[PDB]
A = this chain, B = another copy of it.
Amino acid sequence: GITGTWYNQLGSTFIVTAGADGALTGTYEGNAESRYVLTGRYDSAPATDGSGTALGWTVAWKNNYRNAHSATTWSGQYVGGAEARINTQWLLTSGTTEANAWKSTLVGHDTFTK
Protein backbone atom coordinates (compact mmCIF):
# COMPACT_ATOMS: atom_id res chain seq x y z
CA GLY A 1 0.00 0.00 0.00
CA ILE A 2 1.27 3.43 1.06
CA THR A 3 4.41 2.36 2.96
CA GLY A 4 7.47 2.71 0.73
CA THR A 5 9.55 5.12 -1.27
CA TRP A 6 7.86 7.64 -3.56
CA TYR A 7 9.19 9.99 -6.25
CA ASN A 8 7.60 13.03 -7.88
CA GLN A 9 7.70 14.58 -11.33
CA LEU A 10 10.66 16.71 -10.24
CA GLY A 11 13.10 14.53 -8.32
CA SER A 12 11.91 14.86 -4.75
CA THR A 13 11.77 11.69 -2.72
CA PHE A 14 9.54 10.80 0.17
CA ILE A 15 9.97 7.72 2.36
CA VAL A 16 6.91 6.96 4.32
CA THR A 17 5.50 4.49 6.74
CA ALA A 18 1.77 4.05 7.33
CA GLY A 19 0.90 2.93 10.87
CA ALA A 20 -2.18 0.83 11.55
CA ASP A 21 -3.22 3.79 13.67
CA GLY A 22 -3.70 5.99 10.59
CA ALA A 23 -0.31 7.61 11.24
CA LEU A 24 2.03 8.63 8.46
CA THR A 25 5.75 9.19 9.26
CA GLY A 26 8.83 9.51 7.08
CA THR A 27 11.23 12.00 5.55
CA TYR A 28 11.10 14.21 2.47
CA GLU A 29 14.50 14.06 0.76
CA GLY A 30 19.85 11.21 0.15
CA ASN A 31 22.09 13.87 1.65
CA ALA A 32 21.45 15.00 5.18
CA GLU A 33 20.96 18.69 4.44
CA SER A 34 18.09 17.98 2.05
CA ARG A 35 16.12 15.77 4.41
CA TYR A 36 13.15 16.98 6.42
CA VAL A 37 10.76 15.16 8.81
CA LEU A 38 7.21 14.56 7.67
CA THR A 39 4.14 13.66 9.52
CA GLY A 40 0.55 13.07 8.46
CA ARG A 41 -2.61 10.97 8.57
CA TYR A 42 -4.48 8.68 6.23
CA ASP A 43 -7.80 6.82 6.08
CA SER A 44 -6.89 3.37 7.43
CA ALA A 45 -10.25 1.83 6.36
CA PRO A 46 -11.11 3.26 2.96
CA ALA A 47 -14.28 2.64 1.01
CA THR A 48 -14.43 -0.59 -0.96
CA ASP A 49 -15.89 0.71 -4.22
CA GLY A 50 -12.89 1.71 -6.31
CA SER A 51 -12.39 5.01 -4.47
CA GLY A 52 -8.90 6.08 -3.49
CA THR A 53 -7.50 6.46 0.03
CA ALA A 54 -7.50 9.94 1.50
CA LEU A 55 -4.36 11.18 3.19
CA GLY A 56 -2.39 14.34 4.05
CA TRP A 57 1.03 15.24 5.42
CA THR A 58 3.11 18.23 6.46
CA VAL A 59 6.77 19.18 6.15
CA ALA A 60 8.20 22.14 7.98
CA TRP A 61 11.32 23.20 6.07
CA LYS A 62 13.74 23.40 8.98
CA ASN A 63 16.36 20.73 9.68
CA ASN A 64 19.75 20.74 11.42
CA TYR A 65 21.14 22.38 8.31
CA ARG A 66 18.71 25.00 7.12
CA ASN A 67 15.48 26.90 7.76
CA ALA A 68 13.27 28.47 5.11
CA HIS A 69 10.66 29.61 7.68
CA SER A 70 7.93 27.85 5.75
CA ALA A 71 5.86 24.69 5.70
CA THR A 72 4.11 22.68 3.02
CA THR A 73 0.98 20.60 3.41
CA TRP A 74 -0.06 18.03 0.87
CA SER A 75 -3.63 16.81 0.57
CA GLY A 76 -4.57 14.00 -1.77
CA GLN A 77 -5.26 10.36 -2.25
CA TYR A 78 -3.54 7.07 -2.85
CA VAL A 79 -4.67 5.03 -5.85
CA GLY A 80 -3.29 1.54 -5.84
CA GLY A 81 -2.98 -1.20 -8.39
CA ALA A 82 -0.84 -1.51 -11.50
CA GLU A 83 1.00 1.78 -11.16
CA ALA A 84 0.28 3.02 -7.64
CA ARG A 85 0.15 6.78 -7.39
CA ILE A 86 -0.43 9.54 -4.86
CA ASN A 87 -2.16 12.54 -6.41
CA THR A 88 -1.93 15.72 -4.33
CA GLN A 89 -2.65 19.43 -4.09
CA TRP A 90 -0.36 21.34 -1.73
CA LEU A 91 -0.16 24.61 0.11
CA LEU A 92 3.21 26.25 0.98
CA THR A 93 3.01 28.99 3.62
CA SER A 94 5.94 31.21 4.59
CA GLY A 95 6.22 33.20 7.78
CA THR A 96 5.52 36.84 6.86
CA THR A 97 5.01 40.22 8.40
CA GLU A 98 1.45 41.51 8.43
CA ALA A 99 2.17 43.67 5.38
CA ASN A 100 3.01 40.67 3.17
CA ALA A 101 0.52 38.13 4.58
CA TRP A 102 -1.57 38.42 1.39
CA LYS A 103 1.18 36.70 -0.56
CA SER A 104 2.26 34.17 2.07
CA THR A 105 0.79 31.03 0.48
CA LEU A 106 1.62 29.21 -2.73
CA VAL A 107 -0.59 26.45 -4.18
CA GLY A 108 0.41 23.61 -6.52
CA HIS A 109 -0.09 19.92 -7.35
CA ASP A 110 2.23 16.92 -7.24
CA THR A 111 2.05 13.29 -8.38
CA PHE A 112 4.19 10.64 -6.75
CA THR A 113 5.10 7.21 -8.15
CA LYS A 114 6.44 4.29 -6.08
Measured between alpha carbons, how far is A93 from B37 in the docked complex, in Å?
Answer: 22
A79 within 8 A of B: yes
A3 within 8 A of B: no
Contacts of A98 in B (CB 8 A): 50, 52, 79
Contacts A43-B67, A60-B42, A72-B56 given: A51-B106 contact, CB under 8 Å? no
This chain: copies in complex: 4
Q: Are A105's CB and B106's CB within 8 A?
A: yes
Q: Are B56's CB and A93's CB within 8 A?
A: yes
A114 within 8 A of B: no
Contacts of A23 in B (CB 8 A): 39
Question: A7-47 toward B: CB 8 Å interface, digit per residue (1/0)?
Answer: 00010000000000111100000000000011111111111
